[PDB]
């Protein structure tokens, strides 16, 4: 009942500008120290900025004078100006409530959103089946999923049948190719006998190129 | 200028054992030490504030205690839902001069029995074949250790440089893991060959899945 929502963030060219926002949900963030924490891909994280109930900023060494932390008040929501982005400025920035009148430390966070300060190009996913076979698939249980190749940049969320279809769901992480494009698959494990009767659809999702992809597994015949 | 030196980067152990993590603090934070687990995907959680303070909802097999400023996160009886990376966090008063500072994290794996993965075979769709570009897929799932050495063959003949793999987090249930290896090739190279096979190699088993062109 008590939630930080972020949003923006996605793809920015190396010296562009960037404005990440956190909704709060549940309680005023006026009346807390509130502030911005990252982690680059595969590693610690990395405190960004803070900001205090009476509105006086604290920054970092490297983000001193780049960044500017804000809230409005009227719609309750934190703010992350960044202005003089660099390669080492790509990371999952976090929104998170500090409580300093009791524990002394962070008590609520959000989910992160990717920055990805790169000079590369937004392209789109190609999602391709990957098609369950015939009832000789170790049993009674069968795998099908989606390959989805070539898109830039991260991240990508995929789902099966809308959110319905989650036990025995792998999404496994993307993979840097030598061409610069990601790819991933997804993999979900059925009875083989709810092929024929119960449709299989994954829906990939792409914010940074607003493209969705909805692509139904069709079981693939011999003959 | 403070600074959190964390220890160990990242520990294995089975579920019972007690493990520990190590922070080590520049200077003095008094008790304003806190500890966070994060799983992946997800943002941290609060474990542990004012040194040896338990947070709400958290199991009391995590503990905290202090001695000076070296400062020790204890996990009494490992569970398979402790599979995260665990950060301590440092406030020297009101972080000033960079007196905010986090740990270098620990990522902590589980030891579990052997278990050998189920091997399912995904030869590249048509709509894929459209565009010149071949992607065959080699699926592991629930299999342990992490260790698996997956290889591929095109009618018999070893590949190298030619796939590549990936692996999921350590399963929070079963303490288990998924591989996917992908084999990419050229339209040519695929019509030019007509049986494929990946072979898992887990100790001393060595399992391969195949399928040949056409047929079927």
């Known amino acids: 009942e008590v939630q930080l929502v972020e949003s923006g963030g996605g793809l920015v060219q190396p010296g562009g500008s960037l404005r990440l926002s956190c909704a709060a949900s549940g309680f005023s963030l006026s009346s807390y120290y509130m502030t911005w924490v990252r982690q680059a891909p595969g590693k610690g994280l990395e405190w960004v900025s803070v900001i205090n109930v009476y509105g006086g900023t604290y920054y970092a060494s490297w983000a001193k004078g780049r960044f500017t932390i804000s809230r409005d008040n009227s719609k309750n929501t934190l703010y992350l100006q960044m202005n003089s982005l660099r390669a080492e400025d790509t990371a999952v920035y976090y929104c998170?409530?500090?409580?300093?009148?009791?524990?002394?430390?962070?008590?609520?966070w959000g989910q992160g959103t990717l920055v990805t300060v790169s000079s590369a190009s937004t392209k789109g996913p190609s999602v391709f089946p990957l098609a369950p076979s015939s009832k000789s698939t170790s049993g009674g249980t069968a795998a099908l999923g989606c390959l989805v190749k070539d898109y830039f940049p991260e991240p990508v969320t995929v789902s099966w049948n809308s959110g319905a279809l989650t036990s025995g769901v792998h999404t496994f992480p993307a993979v840097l190719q030598s061409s610069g494009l990601y790819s991933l698959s997804s993999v979900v494990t059925v009875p083989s006998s709810s092929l024929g009767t119960q449709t299989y659809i994954c829906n990939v999702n792409h914010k940074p190129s607003n493209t969705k992809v909805d692509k139904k597994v069709e079981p693939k015949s011999c003959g | 200028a403070i600074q959190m030196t964390q220890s160990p980067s990242s520990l294995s152990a089975s579920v019972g054992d007690r493990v520990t993590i190590t922070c080590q603090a520049s200077?003095?934070?008094?008790?304003?030490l806190s500890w966070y687990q994060q799983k992946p995907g997800k943002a941290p959680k609060l474990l542990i504030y004012?040194?040896?303070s338990l947070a709400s909802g958290v199991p009391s097999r995590f503990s905290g205690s202090r001695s000076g400023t070296k400062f020790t996160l204890t996990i009494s009886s490992l569970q398979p839902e402790d599979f995260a990376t665990y950060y301590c966090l440092g406030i020297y008063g009101d972080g000033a001069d960079d007196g905010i500072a986090f740990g270098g994290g620990t990522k902590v794996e589980i030891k579990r029995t052997v278990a050998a993965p189920s091997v399912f075979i995904f030869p590249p769709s048509d709509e894929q074949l459209k565009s010149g570009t071949a992607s065959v897929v080699c699926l592991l799932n629930n299999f342990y250790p992490r260790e698996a050495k997956v290889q591929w063959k095109v009618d018999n003949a070893l590949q190298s440089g030619n796939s590549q793999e990936s692996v999921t987090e350590q399963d929070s249930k079963d303490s288990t893991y998924s591989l996917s290896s992908t084999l990419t090739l050229s339209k040519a190279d695929y019509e030019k060959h007509k049986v494929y096979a990946c072979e898992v190699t887990q100790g001393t088993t060595s399992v391969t899945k195949s399928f040949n062109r056409g047929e079927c």
């Open positions: 200077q003095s934070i008094s008790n304003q």
């Open positions: 998170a409530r500090e409580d300093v009148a009791v524990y002394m430390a962070i008590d609520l």
């Open positions: 004012d040194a040896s």
